[PDB]
């Protein structure tokens, strides 16, 4: 209950899941009927934008490093949104560390 949840992508309701077993970890979103499927490699993400907790809107956006690619998601429950955000924070942070080390060396 910390790697899956309901989310809305491009005005389409679906289930958002975090797949960490396969390296690199990628964010996969699937529609309820399975017609639409979206996959994003977390290694390409540069920053993680999230709406403030003081606003009724509950969007979470990931921006890819370079017309940079932008992925936006909307959730339903703040607890689900926060739980996904905390997990995503760990993945993005580690990949950023690897990028710094790779360029540093």
Partner 1 sequence: DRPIDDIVKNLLKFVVRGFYGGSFVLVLDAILFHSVLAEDDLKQLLSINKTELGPLIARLRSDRLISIHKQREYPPNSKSVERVYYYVKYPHAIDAIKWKVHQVVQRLKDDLDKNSEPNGYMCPICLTKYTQLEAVQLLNFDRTEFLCSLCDEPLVEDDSGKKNKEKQDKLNRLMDQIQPIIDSLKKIDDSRIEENTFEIALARLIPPQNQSHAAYTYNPKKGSTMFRPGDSAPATLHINITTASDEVAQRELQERQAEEKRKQNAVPEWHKQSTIGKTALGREERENEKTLNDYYAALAKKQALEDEFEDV
Partner 2 sequence: KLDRIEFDPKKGTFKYLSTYDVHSPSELLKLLRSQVTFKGISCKDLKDGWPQCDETINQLEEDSKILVLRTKKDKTPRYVWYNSGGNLKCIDEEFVKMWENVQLPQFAELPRKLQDLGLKPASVDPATIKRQITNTHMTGILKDYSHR
Partner 3 sequence: VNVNLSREKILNIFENYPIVKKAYTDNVPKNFKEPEFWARFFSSKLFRK
Torsion of CA 82, 86, 92, 96, to 10 degrees: 130
**From CA 83, how far away is CA 16, in angstroms rounded?**
12
User: What are the CA-CA distances from residue 20 to residues 13, 26, 31 (Å)?
Assistant: 23, 7, 20
Q: Is 32 in the site for partner 1 (CB under 8 A)?
A: yes
51 binds partner 1 (CB under 8 A): yes
Select the residue interacting with partner 2 from 20, 24, 32, 89 (CB under 8 A). Answer: 32
**Toward partner 2, which CB reaches closer, 32 or 39?**
32
Give the position of tokens 């921006």.
63
* Given 21, 22, 34, 66, the residue binding partner 2 (CB under 8 A): 34
19 interacts with, out of partner 3, partner 2, partner 1, none, CB within 5 to 8 A per kind: none
């Amino acid at each position: 209950m910390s790697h899956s949840g309901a989310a809305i992508f491009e005005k389409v309701s679906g289930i958002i899941a975090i797949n960490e077993d396969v390296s690199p970890a990628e964010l996969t979103w699937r529609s309820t009927d399975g017609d639409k499927v979206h996959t994003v490699v977390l290694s390409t993400i540069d920053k993680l934008q999230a709406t403030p907790a003081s606003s009724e809107k509950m969007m979470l956006r990931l921006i890819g490093k370079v017309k940079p690619q932008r992925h936006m998601f909307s959730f339903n429950n703040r607890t689900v949104m926060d739980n996904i955000k905390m997990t995503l924070q760990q993945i993005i942070s580690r990949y950023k560390d690897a990028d710094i080390y790779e360029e540093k060396r």
